[PDB]
Amino acid sequence: MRKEEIKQAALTLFANNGFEGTSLADIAGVVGLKKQSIYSHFKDKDDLFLSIMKDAKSTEIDYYRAKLRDSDLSRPDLVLSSLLFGVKELYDTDEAYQFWLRYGFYPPKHLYEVVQADITENVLQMEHEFTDLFSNWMEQKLIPMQDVETMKEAYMGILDAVIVDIVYVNDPERTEKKITALWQIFWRGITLKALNL
Template structure:
């Protein structure tokens, strides 16, 4: 039980203060234990941080997978546009994903390599889902484009990344929406039937 409480407290403080601005003392105080008791559950701050990070990563993967498997793909425009708004919603409303997004862009310097490895795993997963979908849509002639599924996946992922940057650094709802709509309009114009 304390382990889960420690992770929740760590998530809260890492999301607010970043890695460097969070102390194990803050986390321990939040849970109502002594700092030294944290070491019964985690080797140290790095291990705690990475476990919270990996759980957030798994939450993102799960949410994206759920979107792809529970939404109707027959209307390509609705599916892809809905996916972009789903990403905005995920990162604005889920505290774990807010933390994940910020740490993906601003990781602790000494954990940069480990964090980027986790981020890459999500990118590869998302690109696989998108490429399979684009291949099906091309085969069924649901979209027309001179580009192949790889290029369409890369272009669409560029929109996703632009939205994530906007969310990570600015998070102004109207600006995120404005950017999403403009990027979508240009992208869709290039692939619609």
């Protein structure tokens, strides 16, 4: 559809040229239209940007949910390490996720509150998913009993460190080393064991 062609053209231009650098005339020209036709489908440039942000929001949370629900939940070490490396692979391959992570670090100022609500909605969903999963793993005696909130806060903090690296550092070697080190120390801290035996 034309609406989705407009969103795809805007996504590319926004992700590569920034918000202020991207005009509706630019977007319309990519799809072969005039500016007036974009208003047939979106209220203004803010609405177009926020419509793409809403799609990208779903991209992120659907990915986390697949990683935390569709994997082998008897292996917490694989589940949680796979999600850390996974966000790196999703950033490499999904243009909407790139858009999401990059604009999370610098949203248009007049849209900050709406973008913040999108991010917050996903963080709360992640917090609930981690809290329930970590509790189940402790009851199953797969990891030592310990404060669930601490484990969730530390894991989401390590996710933040990985996300900063992927967005600001263009070096897959430096990123792989950083994720591996964070994972190794985190998992030692959670399991209070140096290796499973």
